[PDB]
């Protein structure tokens, strides 16, 4: 876009945050939120939703 501001937002449904390929939960990556040695959260695993898809 050639508007004044290039910032855009997107509200993500909570169901799209989960482990890759439905692997088991780990010590550092629980329910799609990867956690370092401390309690901080580093990055999230946003899935892809296909409405005709199962």
């Amino acid at each position: 876009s050639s508007r004044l501001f290039r910032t855009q937002f997107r509200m993500v449904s909570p169901k799209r945050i989960s482990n890759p390929n439905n692997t088991g939960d780990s010590r550092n990556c629980r329910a799609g939120v990867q956690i370092n040695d401390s309690g901080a959260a580093l990055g999230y695993y946003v899935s892809e939703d296909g409405y005709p898809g199962w």
Partner: protein, 337 residues
């Protein structure tokens, strides 16, 4: 009589895809029936002396050759039915317990993990079988057999014979460095790493000259570990030997109920840590897969319900993997018997 489940272990084998990791990187997915690999001879005769009169004998321009390959197909599947969900699980305590529907999301996870592990084992076996010998054959009971054959020179795959075998000749006054040089002379390109089956490593380090090459002040720069370093792990990155790196690989794959080792009983493999290797994935063939758009991808999962009399909700993974080596004669395989 009551009970409590305090602990419940899991049993596995030493599985680690070293050969896939080191030598096979930069995967290429391809939406094509068959792929090509081309080699150009690059061999120029020295110019024969010609009088300034005759002025002839044109020399042909060099031309290469091509090879055609096709990928296989692999699909393991699992199942789960309400008949086996009711009773109990071997990793659940008699107290508390879980619901007859939560036990349905443990068997599913176990199944998916087993499918992924089987696919990984297939990929590792395909990767290893190409390194040891130039060609490997892909076959099964329902799959029509196809063979992938990279062109590897006969000078490689050096197998020891009645003469020049390390086992027979004495461990004092013999140096194997002479041999590791003559064997490496056949390789095309610099070699940088050696892979030892554990018995081969045990046979190699027994030589007294090798133990001399460690504690010499200026005779070399190699540092090794002739003590015990790794006892349970599948790979053990030991020290360098002059310039080359030494690795001992002992991996396990199971065909039928038994366990088997990947490297066959004390082989030694030369090679380069930057060897050009290809990881190609074929086209998955499911008419429900081709709907999404997914094609020439790795590990397409799916599941469905059969609506049969005892029900059942299956689970499935399918990959269609292929392993290729762009330069086949760059490695050197030694029987070392």
């Amino acid at each position: 009589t009551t009970a409590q489940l305090l602990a419940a272990n899991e049993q596995k084998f030493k599985f680690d895809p070293l050969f896939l990791r080191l030598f096979f990187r930069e995967s290429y997915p391809f939406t094509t029936e068959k792929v090509y690999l081309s080699q150009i001879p690059g061999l120029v005769n020295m110019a024969l002396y010609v009088s300034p009169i005759v002025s002839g004998e044109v020399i042909r321009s060099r031309g290469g050759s091509t090879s055609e390959f096709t990928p296989g197909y692999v699909k393991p599947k699992h199942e789960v039915n309400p008949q086996m969900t009711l009773r109990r699980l071997p990793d659940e305590d008699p107290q508390n317990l879980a619901d007859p529907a939560y036990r349905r999301r443990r068997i599913i996870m176990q199944n998916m993990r087993d499918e992924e592990l089987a696919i990984a084992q297939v990929e590792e076996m395909q990767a290893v079988s190409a390194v040891l010998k130039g060609k490997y054959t892909m076959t099964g009971e329902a799959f029509d057999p196809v063979e992938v054959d990279m062109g590897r020179s006969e000078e490689n795959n050096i197998t020891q014979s009645g003469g020049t075998e390390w086992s027979k000749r004495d461990k004092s006054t013999y140096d194997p460095t002479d041999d590791i040089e003559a064997y490496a002379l056949n390789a095309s390109g610099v070699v940088n790493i050696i892979v030892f089956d554990p018995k081969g490593w045990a046979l190699f380090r027994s030589f007294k000259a090798v133990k001399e090459k460690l504690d010499t002040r200026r005779g070399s720069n190699s540092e090794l570990e002739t003590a015990v370093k790794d006892l349970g792990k599948a790979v053990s990155y030991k020290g360098m030997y002059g310039d080359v790196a030494i690795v001992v690989y002992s991996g396990q794959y199971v065909e039928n109920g038994v366990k088997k080792n990947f490297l066959p009983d004390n082989t030694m493999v030369l090679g380069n840590t930057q060897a050009r290797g290809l990881r190609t994935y074929g086209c998955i063939q499911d008419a429900d897969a081709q709907r999404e758009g997914i094609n020439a991808s790795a590990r397409y999962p799916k599941n469905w319900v059969t609506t049969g009399d005892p029900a059942r909700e299956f689970t499935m993974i399918q990959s269609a993997p292929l392993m290729l080596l762009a330069d086949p004669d760059e490695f050197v395989s030694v029987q070392l018997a």
